[PDB]
Short mmCIF file of N, CA and C (backbone and C1' of nucleotides) in Angstrom, two decimals:
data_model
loop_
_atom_site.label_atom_id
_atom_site.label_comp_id
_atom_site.label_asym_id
_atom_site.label_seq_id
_atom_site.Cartn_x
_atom_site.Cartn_y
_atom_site.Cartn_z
N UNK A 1 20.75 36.06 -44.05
CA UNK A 1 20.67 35.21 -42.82
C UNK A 1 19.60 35.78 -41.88
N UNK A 2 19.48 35.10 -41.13
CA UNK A 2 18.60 35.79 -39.88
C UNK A 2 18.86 35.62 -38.39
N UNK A 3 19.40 36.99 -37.59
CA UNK A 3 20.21 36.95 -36.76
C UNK A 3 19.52 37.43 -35.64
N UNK A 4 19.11 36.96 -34.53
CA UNK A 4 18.50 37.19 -33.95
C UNK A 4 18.69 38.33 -33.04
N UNK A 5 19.63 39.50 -33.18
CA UNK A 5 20.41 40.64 -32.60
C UNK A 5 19.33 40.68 -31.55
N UNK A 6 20.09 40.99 -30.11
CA UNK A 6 19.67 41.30 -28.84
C UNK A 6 20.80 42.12 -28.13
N UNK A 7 20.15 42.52 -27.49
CA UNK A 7 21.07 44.22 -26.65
C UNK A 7 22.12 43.45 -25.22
N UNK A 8 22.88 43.44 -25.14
CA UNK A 8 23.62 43.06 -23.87
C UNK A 8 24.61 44.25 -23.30
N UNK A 9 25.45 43.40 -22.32
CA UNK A 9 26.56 44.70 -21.64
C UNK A 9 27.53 44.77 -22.24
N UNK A 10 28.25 43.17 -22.81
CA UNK A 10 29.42 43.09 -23.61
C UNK A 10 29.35 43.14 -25.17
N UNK A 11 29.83 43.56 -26.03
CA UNK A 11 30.19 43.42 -27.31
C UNK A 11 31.24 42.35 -27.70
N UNK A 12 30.37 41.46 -28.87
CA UNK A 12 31.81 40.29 -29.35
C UNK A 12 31.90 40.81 -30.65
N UNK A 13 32.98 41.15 -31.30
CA UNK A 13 33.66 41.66 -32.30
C UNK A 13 34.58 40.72 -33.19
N UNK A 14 33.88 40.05 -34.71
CA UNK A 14 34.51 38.69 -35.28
C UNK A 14 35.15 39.37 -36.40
N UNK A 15 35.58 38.36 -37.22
CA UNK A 15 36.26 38.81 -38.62
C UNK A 15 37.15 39.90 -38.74
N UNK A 16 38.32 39.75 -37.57
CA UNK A 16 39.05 40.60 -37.44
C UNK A 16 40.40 40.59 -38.27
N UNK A 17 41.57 40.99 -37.91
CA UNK A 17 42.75 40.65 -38.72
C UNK A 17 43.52 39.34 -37.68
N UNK A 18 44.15 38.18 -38.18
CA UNK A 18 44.58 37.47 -37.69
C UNK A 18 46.71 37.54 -37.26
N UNK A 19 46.27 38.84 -36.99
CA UNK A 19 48.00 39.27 -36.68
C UNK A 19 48.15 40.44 -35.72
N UNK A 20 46.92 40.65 -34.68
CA UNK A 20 47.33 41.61 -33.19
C UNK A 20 47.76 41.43 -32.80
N UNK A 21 48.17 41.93 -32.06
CA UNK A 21 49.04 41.65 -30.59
C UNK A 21 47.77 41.76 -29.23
N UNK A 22 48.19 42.15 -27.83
CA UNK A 22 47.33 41.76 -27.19
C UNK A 22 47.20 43.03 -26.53
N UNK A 23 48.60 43.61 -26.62
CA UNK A 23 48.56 45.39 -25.93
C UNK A 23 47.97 46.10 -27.10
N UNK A 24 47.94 45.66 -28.58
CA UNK A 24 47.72 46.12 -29.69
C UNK A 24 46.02 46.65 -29.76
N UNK A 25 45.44 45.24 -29.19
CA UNK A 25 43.59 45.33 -30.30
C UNK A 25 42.91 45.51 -28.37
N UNK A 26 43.20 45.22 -27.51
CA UNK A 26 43.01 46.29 -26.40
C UNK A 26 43.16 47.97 -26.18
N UNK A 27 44.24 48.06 -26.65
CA UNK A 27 44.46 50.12 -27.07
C UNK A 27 43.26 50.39 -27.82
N UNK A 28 43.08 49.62 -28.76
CA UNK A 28 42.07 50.14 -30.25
C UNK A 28 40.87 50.31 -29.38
N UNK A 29 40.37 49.01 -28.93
CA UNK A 29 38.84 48.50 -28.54
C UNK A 29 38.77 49.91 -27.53
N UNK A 30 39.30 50.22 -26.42
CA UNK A 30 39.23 51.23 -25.17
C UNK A 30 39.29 52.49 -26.27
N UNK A 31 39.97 52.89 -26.66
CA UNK A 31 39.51 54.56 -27.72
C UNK A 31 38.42 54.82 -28.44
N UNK A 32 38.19 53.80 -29.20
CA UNK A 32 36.80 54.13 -29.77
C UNK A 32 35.56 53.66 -29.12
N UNK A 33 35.36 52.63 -28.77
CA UNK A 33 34.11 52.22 -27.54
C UNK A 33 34.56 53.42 -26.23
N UNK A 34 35.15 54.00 -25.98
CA UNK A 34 35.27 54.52 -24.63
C UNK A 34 34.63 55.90 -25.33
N UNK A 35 35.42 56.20 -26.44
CA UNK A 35 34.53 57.49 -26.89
C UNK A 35 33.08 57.51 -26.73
N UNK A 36 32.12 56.47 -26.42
CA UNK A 36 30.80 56.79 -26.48
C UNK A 36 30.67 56.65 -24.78
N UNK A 37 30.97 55.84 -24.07
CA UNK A 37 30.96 56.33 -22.77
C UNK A 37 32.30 55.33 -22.18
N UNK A 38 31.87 55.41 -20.52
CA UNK A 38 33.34 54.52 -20.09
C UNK A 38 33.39 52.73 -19.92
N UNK A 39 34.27 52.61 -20.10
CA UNK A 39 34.77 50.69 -20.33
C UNK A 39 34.90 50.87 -18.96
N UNK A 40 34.69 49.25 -18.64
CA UNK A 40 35.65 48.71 -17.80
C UNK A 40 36.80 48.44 -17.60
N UNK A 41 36.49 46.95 -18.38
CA UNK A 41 37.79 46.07 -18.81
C UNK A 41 37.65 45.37 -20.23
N UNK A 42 38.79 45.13 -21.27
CA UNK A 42 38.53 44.35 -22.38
C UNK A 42 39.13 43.08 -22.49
N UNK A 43 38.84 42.38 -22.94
CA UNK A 43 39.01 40.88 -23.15
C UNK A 43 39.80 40.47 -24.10
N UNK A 44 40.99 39.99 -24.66
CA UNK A 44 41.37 39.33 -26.23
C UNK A 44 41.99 37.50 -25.79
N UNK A 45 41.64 36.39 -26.79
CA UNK A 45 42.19 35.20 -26.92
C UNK A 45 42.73 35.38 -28.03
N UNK A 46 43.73 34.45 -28.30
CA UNK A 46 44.07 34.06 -29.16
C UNK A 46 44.07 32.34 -29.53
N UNK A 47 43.01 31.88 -29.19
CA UNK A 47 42.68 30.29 -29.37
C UNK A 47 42.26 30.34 -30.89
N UNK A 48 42.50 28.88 -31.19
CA UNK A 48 41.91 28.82 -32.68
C UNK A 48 39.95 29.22 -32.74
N UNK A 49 39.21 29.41 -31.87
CA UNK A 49 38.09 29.46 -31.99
C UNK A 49 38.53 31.24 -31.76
N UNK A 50 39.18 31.16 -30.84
CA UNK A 50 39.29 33.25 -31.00
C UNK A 50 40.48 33.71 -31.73
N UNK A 51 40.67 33.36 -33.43
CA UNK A 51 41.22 33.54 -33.87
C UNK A 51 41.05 35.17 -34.62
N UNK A 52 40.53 35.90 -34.34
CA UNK A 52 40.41 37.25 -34.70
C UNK A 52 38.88 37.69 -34.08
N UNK A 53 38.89 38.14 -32.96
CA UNK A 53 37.67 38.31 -32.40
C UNK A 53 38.07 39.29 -30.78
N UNK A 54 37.00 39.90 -30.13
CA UNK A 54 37.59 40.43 -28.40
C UNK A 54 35.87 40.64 -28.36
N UNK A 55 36.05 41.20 -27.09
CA UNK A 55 35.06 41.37 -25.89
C UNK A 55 34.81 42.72 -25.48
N UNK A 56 33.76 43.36 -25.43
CA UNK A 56 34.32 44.62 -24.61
C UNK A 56 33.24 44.87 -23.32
N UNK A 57 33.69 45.32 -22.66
CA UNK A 57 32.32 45.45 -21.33
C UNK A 57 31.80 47.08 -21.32
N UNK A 58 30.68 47.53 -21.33
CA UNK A 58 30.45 48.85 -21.62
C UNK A 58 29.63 49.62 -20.74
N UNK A 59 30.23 50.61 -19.86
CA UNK A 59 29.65 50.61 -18.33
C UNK A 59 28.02 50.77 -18.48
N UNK A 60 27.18 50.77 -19.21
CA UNK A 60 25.89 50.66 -19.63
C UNK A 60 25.02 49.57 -20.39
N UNK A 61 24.16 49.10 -20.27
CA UNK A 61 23.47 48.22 -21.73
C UNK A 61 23.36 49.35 -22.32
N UNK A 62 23.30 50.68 -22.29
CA UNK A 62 22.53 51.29 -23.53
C UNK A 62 24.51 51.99 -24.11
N UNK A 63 25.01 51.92 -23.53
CA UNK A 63 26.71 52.61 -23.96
C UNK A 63 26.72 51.62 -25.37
N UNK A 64 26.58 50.38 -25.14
CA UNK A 64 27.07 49.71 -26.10
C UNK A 64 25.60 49.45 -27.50
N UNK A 65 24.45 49.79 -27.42
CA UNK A 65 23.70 49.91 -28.35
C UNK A 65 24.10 51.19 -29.52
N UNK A 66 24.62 52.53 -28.85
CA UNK A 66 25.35 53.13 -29.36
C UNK A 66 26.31 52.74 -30.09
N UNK A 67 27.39 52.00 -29.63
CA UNK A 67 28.95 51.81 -29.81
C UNK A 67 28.36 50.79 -31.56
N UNK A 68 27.37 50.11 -31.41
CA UNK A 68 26.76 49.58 -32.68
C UNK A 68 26.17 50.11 -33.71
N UNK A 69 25.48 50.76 -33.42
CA UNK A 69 24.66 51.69 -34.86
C UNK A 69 25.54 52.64 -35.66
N UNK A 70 26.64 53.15 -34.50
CA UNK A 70 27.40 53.54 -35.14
C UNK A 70 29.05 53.03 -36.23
N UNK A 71 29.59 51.95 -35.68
CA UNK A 71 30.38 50.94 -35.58
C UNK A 71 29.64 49.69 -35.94
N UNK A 72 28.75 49.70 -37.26
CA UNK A 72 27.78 48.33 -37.58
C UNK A 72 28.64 48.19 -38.97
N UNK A 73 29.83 47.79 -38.88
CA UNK A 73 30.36 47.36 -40.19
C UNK A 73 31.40 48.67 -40.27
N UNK A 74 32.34 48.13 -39.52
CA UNK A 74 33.31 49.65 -39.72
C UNK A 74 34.65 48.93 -39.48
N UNK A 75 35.66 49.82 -40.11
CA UNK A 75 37.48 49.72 -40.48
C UNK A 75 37.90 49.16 -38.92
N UNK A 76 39.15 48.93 -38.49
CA UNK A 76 39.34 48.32 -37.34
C UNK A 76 41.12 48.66 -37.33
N UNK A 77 41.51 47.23 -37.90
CA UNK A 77 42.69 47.16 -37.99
C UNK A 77 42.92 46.98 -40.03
N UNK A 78 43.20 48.18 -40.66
CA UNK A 78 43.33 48.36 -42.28
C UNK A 78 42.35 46.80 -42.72
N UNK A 79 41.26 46.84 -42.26
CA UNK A 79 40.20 45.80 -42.60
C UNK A 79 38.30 46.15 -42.12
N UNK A 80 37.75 45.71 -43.23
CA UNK A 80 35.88 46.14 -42.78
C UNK A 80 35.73 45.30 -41.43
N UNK A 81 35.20 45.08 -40.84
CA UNK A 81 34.80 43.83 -40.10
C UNK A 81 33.17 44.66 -39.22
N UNK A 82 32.29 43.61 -38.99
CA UNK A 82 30.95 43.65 -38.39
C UNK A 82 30.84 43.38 -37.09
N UNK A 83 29.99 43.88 -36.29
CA UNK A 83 29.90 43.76 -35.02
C UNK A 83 28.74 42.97 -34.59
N UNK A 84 29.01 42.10 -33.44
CA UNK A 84 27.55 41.35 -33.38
C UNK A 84 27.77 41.36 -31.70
N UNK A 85 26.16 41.71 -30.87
CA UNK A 85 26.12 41.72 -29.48
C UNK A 85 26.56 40.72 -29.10
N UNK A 86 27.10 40.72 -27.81
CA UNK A 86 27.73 38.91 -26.74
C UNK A 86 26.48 38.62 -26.96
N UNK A 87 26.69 36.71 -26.96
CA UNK A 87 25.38 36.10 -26.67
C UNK A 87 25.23 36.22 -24.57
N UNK A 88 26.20 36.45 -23.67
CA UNK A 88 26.19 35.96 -22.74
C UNK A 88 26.48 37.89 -21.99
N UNK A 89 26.88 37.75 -20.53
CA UNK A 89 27.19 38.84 -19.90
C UNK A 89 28.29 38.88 -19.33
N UNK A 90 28.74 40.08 -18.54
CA UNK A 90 30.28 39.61 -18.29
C UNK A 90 30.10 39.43 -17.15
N UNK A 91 31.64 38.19 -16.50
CA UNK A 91 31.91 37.92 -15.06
C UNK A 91 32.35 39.36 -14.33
N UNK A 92 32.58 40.06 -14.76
CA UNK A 92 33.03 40.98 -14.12
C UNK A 92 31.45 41.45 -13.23
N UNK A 93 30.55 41.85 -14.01
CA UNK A 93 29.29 42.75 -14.18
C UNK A 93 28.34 41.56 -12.49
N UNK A 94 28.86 40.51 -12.72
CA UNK A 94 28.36 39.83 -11.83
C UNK A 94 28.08 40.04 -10.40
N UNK A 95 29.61 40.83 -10.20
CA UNK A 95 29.20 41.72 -8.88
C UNK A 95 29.36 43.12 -8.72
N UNK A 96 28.78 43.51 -10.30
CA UNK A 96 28.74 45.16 -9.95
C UNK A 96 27.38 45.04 -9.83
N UNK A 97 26.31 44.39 -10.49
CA UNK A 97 24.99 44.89 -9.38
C UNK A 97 25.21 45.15 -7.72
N UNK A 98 26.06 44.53 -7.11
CA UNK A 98 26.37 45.34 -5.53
C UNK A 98 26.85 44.13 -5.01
N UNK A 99 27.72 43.80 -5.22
CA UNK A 99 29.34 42.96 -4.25
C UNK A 99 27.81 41.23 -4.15
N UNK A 100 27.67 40.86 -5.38
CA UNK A 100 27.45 39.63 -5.71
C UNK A 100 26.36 39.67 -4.47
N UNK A 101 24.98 40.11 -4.67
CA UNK A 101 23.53 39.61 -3.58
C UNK A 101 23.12 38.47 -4.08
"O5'" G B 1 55.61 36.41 -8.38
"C5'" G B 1 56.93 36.87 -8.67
"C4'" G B 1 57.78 35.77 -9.30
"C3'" G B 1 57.19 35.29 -10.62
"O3'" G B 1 57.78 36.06 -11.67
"C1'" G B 1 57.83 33.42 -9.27
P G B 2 56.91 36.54 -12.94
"O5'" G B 2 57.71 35.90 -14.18
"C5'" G B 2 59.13 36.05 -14.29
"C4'" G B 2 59.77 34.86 -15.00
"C3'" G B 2 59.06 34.54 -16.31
"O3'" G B 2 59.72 35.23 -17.37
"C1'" G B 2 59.30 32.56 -15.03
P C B 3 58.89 35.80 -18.63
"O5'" C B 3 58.14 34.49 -19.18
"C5'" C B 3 58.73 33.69 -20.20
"C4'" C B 3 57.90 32.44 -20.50
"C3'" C B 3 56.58 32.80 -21.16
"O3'" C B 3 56.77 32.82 -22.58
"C1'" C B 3 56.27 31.11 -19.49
P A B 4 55.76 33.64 -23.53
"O5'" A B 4 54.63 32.54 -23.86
"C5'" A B 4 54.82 31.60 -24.92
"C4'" A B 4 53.99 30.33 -24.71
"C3'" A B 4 52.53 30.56 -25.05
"O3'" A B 4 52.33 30.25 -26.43
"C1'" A B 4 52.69 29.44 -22.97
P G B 5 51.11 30.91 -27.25
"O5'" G B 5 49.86 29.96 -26.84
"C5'" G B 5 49.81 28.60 -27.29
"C4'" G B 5 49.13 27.70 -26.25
"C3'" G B 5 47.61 27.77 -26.33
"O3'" G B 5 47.16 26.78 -27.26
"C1'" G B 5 48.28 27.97 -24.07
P A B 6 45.65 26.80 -27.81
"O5'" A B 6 44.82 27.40 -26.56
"C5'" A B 6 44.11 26.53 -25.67
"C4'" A B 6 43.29 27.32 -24.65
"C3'" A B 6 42.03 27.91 -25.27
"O3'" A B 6 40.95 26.99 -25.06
"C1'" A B 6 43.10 29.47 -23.78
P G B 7 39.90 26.67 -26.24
"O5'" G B 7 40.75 25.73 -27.23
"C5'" G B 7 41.37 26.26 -28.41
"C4'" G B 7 41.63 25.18 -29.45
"C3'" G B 7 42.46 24.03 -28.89
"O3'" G B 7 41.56 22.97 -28.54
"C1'" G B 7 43.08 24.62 -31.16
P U B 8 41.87 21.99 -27.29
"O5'" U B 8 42.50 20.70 -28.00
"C5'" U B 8 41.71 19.52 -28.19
"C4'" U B 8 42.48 18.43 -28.93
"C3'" U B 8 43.58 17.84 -28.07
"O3'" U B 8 43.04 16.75 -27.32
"C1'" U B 8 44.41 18.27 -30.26
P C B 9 43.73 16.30 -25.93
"O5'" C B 9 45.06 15.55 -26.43
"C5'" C B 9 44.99 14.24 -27.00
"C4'" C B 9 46.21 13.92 -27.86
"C3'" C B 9 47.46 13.73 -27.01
"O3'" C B 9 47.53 12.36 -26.61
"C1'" C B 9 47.95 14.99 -28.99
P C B 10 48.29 11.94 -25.26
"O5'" C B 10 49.83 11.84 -25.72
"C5'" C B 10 50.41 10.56 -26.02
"C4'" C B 10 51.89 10.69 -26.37
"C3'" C B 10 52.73 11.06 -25.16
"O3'" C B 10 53.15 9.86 -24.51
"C1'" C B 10 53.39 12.36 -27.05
P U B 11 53.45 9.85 -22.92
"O5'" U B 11 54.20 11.25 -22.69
"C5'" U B 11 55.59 11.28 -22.35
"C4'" U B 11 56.07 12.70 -22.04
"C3'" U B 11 55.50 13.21 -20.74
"O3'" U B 11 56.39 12.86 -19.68
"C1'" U B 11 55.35 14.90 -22.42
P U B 12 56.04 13.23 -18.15
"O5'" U B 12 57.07 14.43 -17.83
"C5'" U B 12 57.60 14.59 -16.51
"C4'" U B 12 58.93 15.35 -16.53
"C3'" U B 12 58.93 16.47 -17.57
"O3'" U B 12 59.69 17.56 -17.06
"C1'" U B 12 60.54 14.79 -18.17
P C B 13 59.00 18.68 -16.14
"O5'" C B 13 58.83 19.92 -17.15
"C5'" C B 13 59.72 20.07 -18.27
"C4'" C B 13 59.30 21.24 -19.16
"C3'" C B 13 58.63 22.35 -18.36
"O3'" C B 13 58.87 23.59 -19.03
"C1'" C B 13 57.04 21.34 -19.83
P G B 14 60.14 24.50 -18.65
"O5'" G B 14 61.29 23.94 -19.64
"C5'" G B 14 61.06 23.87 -21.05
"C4'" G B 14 62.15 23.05 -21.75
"C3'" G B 14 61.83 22.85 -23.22
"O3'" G B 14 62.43 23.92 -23.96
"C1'" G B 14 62.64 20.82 -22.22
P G B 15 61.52 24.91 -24.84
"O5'" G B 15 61.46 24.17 -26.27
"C5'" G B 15 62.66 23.72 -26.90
"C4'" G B 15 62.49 22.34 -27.54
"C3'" G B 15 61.57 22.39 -28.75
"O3'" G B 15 62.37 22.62 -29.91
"C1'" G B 15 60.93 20.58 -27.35
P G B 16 61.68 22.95 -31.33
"O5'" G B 16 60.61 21.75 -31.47
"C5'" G B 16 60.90 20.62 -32.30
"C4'" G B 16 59.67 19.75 -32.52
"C3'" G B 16 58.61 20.46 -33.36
"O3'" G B 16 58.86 20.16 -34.73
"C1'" G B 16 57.63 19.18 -31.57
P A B 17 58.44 21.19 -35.90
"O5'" A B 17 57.10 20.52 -36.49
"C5'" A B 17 57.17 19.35 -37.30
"C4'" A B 17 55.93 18.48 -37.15
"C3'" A B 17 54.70 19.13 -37.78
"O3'" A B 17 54.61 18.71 -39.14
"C1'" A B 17 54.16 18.32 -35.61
P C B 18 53.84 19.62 -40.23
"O5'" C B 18 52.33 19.66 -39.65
"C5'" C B 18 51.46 18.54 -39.84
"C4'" C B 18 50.16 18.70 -39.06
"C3'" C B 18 49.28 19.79 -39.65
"O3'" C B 18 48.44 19.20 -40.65
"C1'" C B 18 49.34 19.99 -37.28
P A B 19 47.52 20.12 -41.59
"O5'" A B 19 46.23 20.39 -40.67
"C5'" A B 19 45.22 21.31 -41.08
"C4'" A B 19 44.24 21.62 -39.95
"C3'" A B 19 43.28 22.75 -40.33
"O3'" A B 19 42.07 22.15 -40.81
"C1'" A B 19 44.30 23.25 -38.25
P U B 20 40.97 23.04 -41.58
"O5'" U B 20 40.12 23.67 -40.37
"C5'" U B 20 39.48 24.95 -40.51
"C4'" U B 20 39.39 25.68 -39.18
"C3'" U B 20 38.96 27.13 -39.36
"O3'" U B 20 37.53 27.19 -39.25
"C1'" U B 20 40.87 27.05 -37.96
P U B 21 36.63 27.73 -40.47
"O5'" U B 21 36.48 29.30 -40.13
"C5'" U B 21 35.52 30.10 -40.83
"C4'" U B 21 34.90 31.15 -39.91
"C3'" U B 21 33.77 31.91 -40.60
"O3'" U B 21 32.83 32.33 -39.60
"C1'" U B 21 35.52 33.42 -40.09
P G B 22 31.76 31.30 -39.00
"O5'" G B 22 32.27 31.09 -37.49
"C5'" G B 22 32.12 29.83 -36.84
"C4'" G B 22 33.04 29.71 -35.63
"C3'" G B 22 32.73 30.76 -34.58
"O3'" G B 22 31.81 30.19 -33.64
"C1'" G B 22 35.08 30.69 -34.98
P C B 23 30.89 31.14 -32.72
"O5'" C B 23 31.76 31.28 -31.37
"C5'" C B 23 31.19 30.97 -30.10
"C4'" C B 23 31.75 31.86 -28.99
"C3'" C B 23 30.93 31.74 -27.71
"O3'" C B 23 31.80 32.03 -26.61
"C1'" C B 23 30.74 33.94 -28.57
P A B 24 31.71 31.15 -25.26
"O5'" A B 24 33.01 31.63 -24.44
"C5'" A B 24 34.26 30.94 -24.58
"C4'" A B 24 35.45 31.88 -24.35
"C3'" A B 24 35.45 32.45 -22.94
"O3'" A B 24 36.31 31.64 -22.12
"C1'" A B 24 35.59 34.22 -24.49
P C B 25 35.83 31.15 -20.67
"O5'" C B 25 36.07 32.45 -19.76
"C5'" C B 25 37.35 32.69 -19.16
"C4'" C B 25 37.46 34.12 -18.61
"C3'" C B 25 36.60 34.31 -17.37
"O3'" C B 25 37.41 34.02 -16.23
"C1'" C B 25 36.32 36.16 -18.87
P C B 26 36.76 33.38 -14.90
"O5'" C B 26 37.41 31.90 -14.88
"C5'" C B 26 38.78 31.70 -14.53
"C4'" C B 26 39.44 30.65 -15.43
"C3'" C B 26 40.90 30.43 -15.05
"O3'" C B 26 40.95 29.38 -14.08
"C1'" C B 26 40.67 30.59 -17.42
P U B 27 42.04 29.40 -12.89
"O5'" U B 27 42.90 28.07 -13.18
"C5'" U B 27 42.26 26.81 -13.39
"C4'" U B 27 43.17 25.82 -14.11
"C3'" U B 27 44.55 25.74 -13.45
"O3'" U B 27 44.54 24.66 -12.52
"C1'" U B 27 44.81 26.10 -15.78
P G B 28 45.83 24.36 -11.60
"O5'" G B 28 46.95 23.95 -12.68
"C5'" G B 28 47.16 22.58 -13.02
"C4'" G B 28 48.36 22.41 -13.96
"C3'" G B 28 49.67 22.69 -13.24
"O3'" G B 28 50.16 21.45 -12.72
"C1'" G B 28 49.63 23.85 -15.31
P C B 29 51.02 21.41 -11.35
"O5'" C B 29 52.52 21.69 -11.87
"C5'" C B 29 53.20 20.73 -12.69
"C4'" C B 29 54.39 21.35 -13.41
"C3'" C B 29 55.50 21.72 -12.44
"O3'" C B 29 56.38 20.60 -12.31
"C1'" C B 29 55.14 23.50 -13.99
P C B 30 56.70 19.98 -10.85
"O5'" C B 30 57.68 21.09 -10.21
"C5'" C B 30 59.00 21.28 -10.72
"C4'" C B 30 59.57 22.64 -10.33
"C3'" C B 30 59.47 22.88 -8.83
"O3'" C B 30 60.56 22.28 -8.13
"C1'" C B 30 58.78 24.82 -10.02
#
RNA sequence: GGCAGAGUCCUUCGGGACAUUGCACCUGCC
């Protein structure tokens, strides 16, 4: 395929297992992404379009270029699954450039 | 303030049938 990978703040994470919980694949996402530097906040749906997928916000663009090269096709929940950058940024991040200018 | 969806619909929100390897940060009842 040809994927046009670009660097953002959030990470979207697909092809997951379709049986988390919500306190469950939040614990996971914050231990190992936090190991490379600090989170914010993480995201999970459970809609049929976010049927095995989350969000993560990574207090850096460059925290989460890390959290990928290393974590580019890695175990999760007793399953492989691939990582692909957000196409978009987070609402949160909106007013950490400095209380929304 | 309880609770689910965040996938569609009947709807008194009480219950109920049926689909999805798919870029989200949100609403309603009382």
């Amino acid at each position: 395929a040809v994927p046009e990978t670009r660097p953002n703040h959030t990470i979207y994470i697909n092809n997951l297992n379709e049986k988390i919980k919500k306190d469950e694949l939040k614990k996971s996402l914050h231990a190992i992404f936090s190991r490379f530097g600090q989170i914010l906040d993480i995201l999970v749906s459970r809609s049929l379009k976010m049927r095995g997928q989350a969000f993560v916000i990574f207090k850096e663009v460059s925290s989460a270029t890390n959290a990928l090269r290393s974590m580019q096709g890695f175990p999760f929940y007793d399953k492989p699954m691939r990582i692909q950058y957000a196409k978009t940024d987070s609402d949160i991040i909106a007013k950490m450039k400095g209380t929304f200018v």
